[PDB]
Design a protein around this ligand. Structure first.
Ligand SMILES: C[C@]12CC[C@@H]3c4ccc(O)cc4CC[C@H]3[C@@H]1[C@@H](O)[C@@H](O)[C@@H]2O
Ligand SMILES: C[C@]12CC[C@@H]3c4ccc(O)cc4CC[C@H]3[C@@H]1[C@@H](O)[C@@H](O)[C@@H]2O
Ligand SMILES: [Cl-]
Lengths: 243, 9, 236, 11
């Protein structure tokens, strides 16, 4: 397994170099927003990002080591968390706003135009503010985003008893080693290293929460025929089960 | 399944 | 800020001392299960447990420092996560079963009795198996449960900073336990990460369970206590 | 007058 033999510094380089591009929305400023048109812009954007996410996942060390069935499951579990952590990262330098794309920077009042969205917008804004106060570094961000990919679906590998996916866990341990290496090299004390590692990982629980609320919100928009979803988005949504 | 296809390409 | 003064060992003794009692189901072993009947037992149980959880929360160091308002908020956010991590812990020693109560130990098949529940049972069993795999210790368990209480609504201030100070102390305590157990530094950081990543999965299960409980409430399969309806309503 | 409010004040 290549991944396992990477050094910290090599782990960081692969992840940094695998980063996807920042895409643009189809925002058209000649027109006012509706619930329907806002949902349209956001899902059109998500849909295009997914194609880049799949390519990025393939470049996360150890990911290509799994069966297609396993890769499919992980991305199905993590895709919205991953779009969200990316969004909150892009938004860090824009206190009060969410940078969905460079041409689509929205404040919570604009989020109100979609029924049930503002509550999630508020959680996203708060997460961005938390990253800003913690002074999250890009090297640390890429590590968390990979941990999300490898972790979120891991305890749903049911055979229905949990399969031992030591490979994934071995990779997750390497990313832990890398986060710690980055913090040490950043000058943090031993106690500060474990404290920060904890603060960063606890945020992932909040990102999971936001993902579950956004998935429910997206399912609601579909069941109200607010926006046509791409077949990919329909399949990713369907992976989660909502009623 | 679309994802399955995209993961091969 | 007395919680800030506590030593690692004193934090562990405090949390161990604060552990709630293990409650019994009303279940009668001779009588067979229904869907309204299964939900009745589970929810009757949860509701009695809730009263003890509140006493426990009050003994989690730093919790009583917060406004009554913030205390209400943390418990409304965390309560189902806390019941689930307790459940998972009780079941660690019963592979393939969930020890809801000593007289109510359910196999995954017994979860098919309630519409939509088997999927959550599967996740709970997988967590139990993961704890078993890691050989999770009681001392580690009580630290994790307190982390759930204080973390699960901290993003939903002098208050904020206090909570994060306390969370850092519980982190110091976990690491203390692992170093006392003989783990290398590298192994300590790895185990800490493994444990906190599991909280992500417990958050996920709570979310799903909350939408499942709401679906039962509507369908009128089971009458819920006022307190439960209130704890359920805060999630909407 | 949430029940949880009363419970926290009373224990
Ligand atoms: C799913 C979603 C539309 C797409 C949004 C998106 C698009 C692109 C992106 O990069 C990140 C995000 C993160 C948030 C995503 C929204 C959720 O908050 C739901 O409320 C809403 O239905
Ligand atoms: C909320 C719940 C009934 C009560 C259950 C319970 C009872 C007691 C307990 O200690 C822990 C748990 C954790 C699981 C709880 C169920 C969720 O999985 C939902 O599917 C279902 O509606
Ligand atoms: Cl009792």
């Amino acid at each position: 397994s290549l991944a396992l033999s990477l050094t910290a510094d090599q782990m960081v380089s692969a992840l940094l170099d695998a980063e996807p591009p920042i895409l643009y929305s189809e925002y058209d400023p000649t027109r006012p927003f509706s619930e329907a048109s806002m949902m349209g812009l956001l899902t059109n954007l998500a849909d295009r990002e997914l194609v880049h996410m799949i390519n990025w996942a393939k470049r996360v060390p150890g990911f290509v080591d799994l069966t297609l069935h396993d890769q499919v499951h992980l991305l199905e579990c993590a895709w919205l968390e991953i779009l969200m952590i990316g969004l909150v990262w892009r938004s860090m330098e824009h206190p009060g706003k969410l940078l969905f794309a460079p041409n689509l920077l929205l404040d919570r009042n604009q989020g109100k135009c979609v029924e049930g969205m503002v509550e999630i917008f508020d959680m996203l804004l708060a997460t961005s503010s938390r990253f800003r106060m913690m002074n999250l570094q890009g090297e640390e961000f890429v590590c968390l985003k990979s941990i999300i990919l490898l972790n979120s679906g891991v305890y749903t590998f049911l055979s229905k008893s949990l399969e031992e996916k030591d490979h994934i866990h071995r990779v997750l341990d390497k990313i832990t080693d890398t986060l710690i290496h980055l913090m040490a090299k950043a000058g943090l004390t031993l106690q500060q290293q474990h404290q920060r590692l904890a603060q960063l990982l606890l945020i992932l629980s909040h990102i999971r929460h936001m993902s579950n609320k956004g998935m429910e919100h997206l399912y609601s928009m579909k069941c109200k025929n607010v926006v046509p979803l791409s077949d990919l988005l329909l399949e990713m949504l369907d992976a989660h089960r909502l009623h | 399944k679309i994802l399955h296809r995209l993961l091969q390409d």
